[PDB]
Design a protein around this nucleic acid. Sequence first.
RNA 1: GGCAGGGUGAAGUCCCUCAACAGAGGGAUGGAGGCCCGCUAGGGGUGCUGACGCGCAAUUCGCUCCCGUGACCCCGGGCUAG
RNA 2: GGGAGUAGCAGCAUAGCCGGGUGAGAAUCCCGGCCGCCGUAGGGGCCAGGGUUCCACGGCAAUGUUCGUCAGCCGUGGGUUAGUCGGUCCUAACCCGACCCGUAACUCGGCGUCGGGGAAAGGGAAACGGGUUUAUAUUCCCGUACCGCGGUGGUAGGUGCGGCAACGCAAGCCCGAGGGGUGACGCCUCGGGGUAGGCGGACCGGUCCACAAGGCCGGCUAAGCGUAUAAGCCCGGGGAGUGCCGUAAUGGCGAGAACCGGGUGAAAGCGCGAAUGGCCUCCCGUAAGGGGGGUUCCGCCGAUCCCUGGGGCCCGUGAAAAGCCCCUCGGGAACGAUCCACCGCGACCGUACCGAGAACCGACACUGGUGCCCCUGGGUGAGAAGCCUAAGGCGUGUCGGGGGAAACCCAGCCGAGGGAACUCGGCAAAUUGGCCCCGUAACUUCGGGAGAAGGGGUGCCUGCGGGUGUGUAACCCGCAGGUCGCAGUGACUAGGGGGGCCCGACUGUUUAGUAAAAACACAGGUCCCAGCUAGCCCGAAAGGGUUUGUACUGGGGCCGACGCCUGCCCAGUG
RNA 3: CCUUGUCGGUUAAAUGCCGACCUGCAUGAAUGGCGUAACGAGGUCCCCACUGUCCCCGGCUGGGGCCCGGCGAAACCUCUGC
Lengths: 62, 84, 237, 50, 89, 146
Amino acid sequence: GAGTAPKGKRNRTPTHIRCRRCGRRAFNVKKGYCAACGFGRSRRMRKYSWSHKWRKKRNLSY
Amino acid sequence: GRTTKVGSAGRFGPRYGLKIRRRVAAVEARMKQKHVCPVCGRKAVRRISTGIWQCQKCGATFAGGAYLPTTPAGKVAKRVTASK
Amino acid sequence: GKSLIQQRRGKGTTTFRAPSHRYRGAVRYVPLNLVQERTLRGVVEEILHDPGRTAPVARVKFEDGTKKLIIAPEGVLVGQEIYIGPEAPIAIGNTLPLAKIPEGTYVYDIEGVPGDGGKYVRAGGTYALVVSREKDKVIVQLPSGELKAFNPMCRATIGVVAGGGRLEKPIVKAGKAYYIAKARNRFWPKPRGVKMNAVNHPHGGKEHHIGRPSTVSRRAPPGRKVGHIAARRTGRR
Amino acid sequence: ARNKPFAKKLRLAKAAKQNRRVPVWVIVKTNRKVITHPKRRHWRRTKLKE
Amino acid sequence: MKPMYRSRSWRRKYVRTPGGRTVIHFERRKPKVAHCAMCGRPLNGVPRGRPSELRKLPKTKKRPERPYPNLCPSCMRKVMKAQVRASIT
Amino acid sequence: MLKTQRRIAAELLKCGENRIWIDPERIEDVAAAITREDIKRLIHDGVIKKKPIKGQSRARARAFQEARKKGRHRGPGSKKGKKTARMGKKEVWMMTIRALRKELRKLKAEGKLDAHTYRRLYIRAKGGQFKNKRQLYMFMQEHGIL
RNA sequence: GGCAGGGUGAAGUCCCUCAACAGAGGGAUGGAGGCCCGCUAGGGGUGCUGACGCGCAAUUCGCUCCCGUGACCCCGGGCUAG
RNA sequence: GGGAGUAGCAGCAUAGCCGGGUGAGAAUCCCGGCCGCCGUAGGGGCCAGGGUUCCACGGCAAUGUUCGUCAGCCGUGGGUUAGUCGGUCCUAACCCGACCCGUAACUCGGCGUCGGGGAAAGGGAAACGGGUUUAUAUUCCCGUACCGCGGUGGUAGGUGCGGCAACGCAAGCCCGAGGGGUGACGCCUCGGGGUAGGCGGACCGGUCCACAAGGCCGGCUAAGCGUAUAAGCCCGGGGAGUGCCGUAAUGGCGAGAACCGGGUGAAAGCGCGAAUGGCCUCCCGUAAGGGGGGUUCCGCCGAUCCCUGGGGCCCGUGAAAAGCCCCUCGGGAACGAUCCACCGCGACCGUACCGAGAACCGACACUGGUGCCCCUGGGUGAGAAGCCUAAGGCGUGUCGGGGGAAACCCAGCCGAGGGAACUCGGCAAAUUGGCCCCGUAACUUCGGGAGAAGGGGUGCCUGCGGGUGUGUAACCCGCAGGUCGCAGUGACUAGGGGGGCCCGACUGUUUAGUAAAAACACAGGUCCCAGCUAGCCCGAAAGGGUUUGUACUGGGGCCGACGCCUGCCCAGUG
RNA sequence: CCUUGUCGGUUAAAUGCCGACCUGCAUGAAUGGCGUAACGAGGUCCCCACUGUCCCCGGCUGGGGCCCGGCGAAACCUCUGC
Ligand SMILES: [Zn+2]
Ligand SMILES: [Zn+2]
Ligand SMILES: [Zn+2]
């Protein structure tokens, strides 16, 4: 069905690889941009006010 | 050959019905007979592709109909523009 | 609600787009600004099947060296010479302006405005007939039966399009229709709207019936034009 | 034969070197305080980020 | 077998070795013979091979000496005769 | 642990690991050996050997083929496939017609047939009249061709 | 990139004998099909309302049953986003 | 804490025993033998993915469904060598940037063009065999080769020939421009020639057997260089029809057949490479090592591997570009190679191991999935079926011991006389079964139904005959006689059949995980809009889909193969 | 709907099946009507054969269950329990 057996189909190419600008594994290899920092799409950094991750990285309050 | 009524549509066997089997058989029988060439006059013309007809002897290649080398409207246009 | 197939086609996705990289190039005549008053001569060097066209095409080589595709007429031979221009004879395969074409002649590949390359009467087995000439307009009978006026300087080619009788033979099988549709990426197989759910179609619902007239106004909004759009009448005769 | 990119190879090499136990002279120098650190990784248990 | 050799453009062949191994060798395929420009008939006196094979041959072992070596002889004679008859006036 | 020795000996003797033999009275000398050179010496001295392949006999099948040639083991209860699968359909016809055509040419070369009669016989054979050369000759005799 | 083996015998192409106003009868060739049998490989999931049901398994196992040159099965590269 | 020293450590592959050893300690680790399992996969090779799991030495606190002296566990040190293998080039579908347009704006939406990217199984220069290591090898060593660039020195040629011809030749150099070819292609089917592999006989050298014969093992040869026929195409001569030549089949001929001669042209084979190289074997104190021998002939089957030619189907037509060969032009110099011999140079990255009933994903050393992706000896046999078996692998689909083994359960075998009386319902089980001969109903869209139904036969031994073939080579097809058994497709393999009714025309698809169907689709029928700056559609706009398209077309609905048919009503809603 | 309608056939015995009749509660012509060869893991009635389905249950084979050595959980649990 939809569970354990389809999990076996996980030896294809990965959706995301390591990103050259920020060091995370969030670079989408078919589209050519990063889902975390925006590298490949934006000269500027991706940063949203509803997100916590950059504040956590800088030990900031929300 | 050894069929009373069916022809080329004996490949169908029981299926798809009378009207359709009859029509396929007739169209294909008239198409697969060797036709007269318009350049050399011999009966050596066969269909290559839809609308394209070729003579085996002289090598002449011409455009025509889907399942026959000529069409009625084509004959009329030939007659009229031969007049003028 | 949810969307219709006719609304998803407008987005331009792969499910709906034509595979024209598979085809032979477009078919256009020669520009006026390079055939002004010259009456060019060419030779037919190949006749070819085209997957996007419904008619066979021919490859013509001209004197300079330029090769081009034309829509092929019933009867044209490999090794035959054709003429394009105003002082071209009246012979099957030649292209002339309408002002030089007698009444009663069978014609194909007619321009809408002069110089536009060819628009009208292109399909396998079609022909148009020249009806009337005047100094301001030429009236032609199109295959739909309709009479239409053209500018007398519009270009047309003489004869009938090749590839007629195509529909004389039944398709017979579903698989043959599969291949015929795949060749041009047509939506196949086609669903019925009365066996869809109500979220999917203005027909639709578990009792499988249209519960309102299937004739729909010309001014209805998109998502609602299904059935018989702006019908003058319905039925047998 | 198995076709790695050079940069991925170098990152895997660092991950390989990182993976050993605390030296014994460190435990001695520290008087049994530092005896284990947070990056013991085994190839069947915890997978890395390629 | 590697995936590159699971590809049916490599014409595998079995060969027994001086050590008794019986191994598989792989080679690329040979291109077909030259054809006439007018008629599409095959040509004579023109050898078949890949580029590396053809570069180990001299010029005169690649085509016949006669003029228009890209045409069959009948079509060549047509061309020469037409030239002659147009060189009359 | 003698896995090293066994694996090296297999690679050197071009055999399998399960066909290597180590003397049970000299396991200690063999454990003392950690190099290919030392393993080679032990193989030269006979402490490590290659066992011979048993081999599968085919004498019973030989005797069966003999008897089948002289006419046994080929009755109705011994068959599992269709007669077409066992004989052929097209191969029989080919070998027949090739035989007939070869024979006809040989006759016409020996001088016994003229071209007209040869042609008519060629056509009869093509049409399927004879089914073998004895029938061909019986027809030539019945008629006046001999 | 791939699909053991076997069967049936469409069109097309003919041969022979007796006759010819018409015809009658006997022999072959050839290899089509969303054809047939088939746990070849592969794909699917009808019944026992079988085993299991803190399982080997958050949908599996066994027997039985269906397709198997096609609107067939699978792979690498891409496209469609609430 | 109780539940409890309980359940589970069975079911789909039931595997251990004897002797010896190590060690504190041995059902569970090592050696030998016996007995077993897999054997078109549990064997061999290798992607992705994983990342050191690879090797040697040393260990046993924890991990391992038991133990453990063992290990994919722990510790200490090691290990991946390339001009020729792959990536670095080309384009495909597709993506991006600039300019430009839109947006209040943008990291948003578009866009023809210009440029740039995009395939570790598509196109695409060049290397094979043997040895060596604990662990790498077409990468190191030995032997023998090839490619590109750059030089040196000679020659062909510039300024040369043989053939009626097809054609045969070393048959000039530099820079540019055109042209032709190759690259470069679908599905189905058939013949011809070869190879790997297999089989049979003879000879040599060995080995297993109270003997005995007989059985079993080994009996080899790469890239590269040189060398030519087959089909097919072609050139000369020749001159045909109450026809002649040919094929498995289709076919061919005054638009030039037969017949004589010839030219070009594949896969292969042959020679050199090449030998105490590899394999087998025989003597000596056995460390270095020592020593001498053999390496031969016929014949059969042959592919799913390689080459080459034919035929058939499409309302369906099955990539492109780089690169490479040839020809002709234009412009330059007087020299000078696509031939021979020699000399030098050839950067960067990957290269260990698994590749799955324990190295990948599924929380696990998970009967699932990824990958059956590529490949596989002998016998019976139609067969890559099932059964037995060689090679190779395993005894770890990782708890064992007792038992004439209590009831009861799971998975199997038999059952007297009856023969569906059981049950909602013949659920389940049984019956039939391969091949050859005979014979075969209704109904029918004349194709089928049909293997309808139904009936006979089948082993072993001894002899006779046929087909093709040169053949007491090899394959296939019949007859007669004798004889044994309850039984001869003796195991394995291997249909139970017939007659009425309803639905749906058929092949096909569906609710991943309680519904496979009468539901969907289908060919076909019929209605509607539309002459193109259209009709229908996306979007805030710019722009866009149908459109590389033009009424035998594109879009929108309903019915649903085929046959006989499809009546009346426009007051109402549209 | 009354309904196991009525008549006939099938059975020793028929709230079933088939064929006919027509007061069609509430059939009917492309929300198609009536038929239909071939096809169906579709639904349904009957006949031949066969059988442990049943009369009526019996005996065997392997694996568990039981005893022995070792590893060693969980669901559940107010206290208790004629
Ligand atoms: Zn980033
Ligand atoms: Zn002609
Ligand atoms: Zn030519």
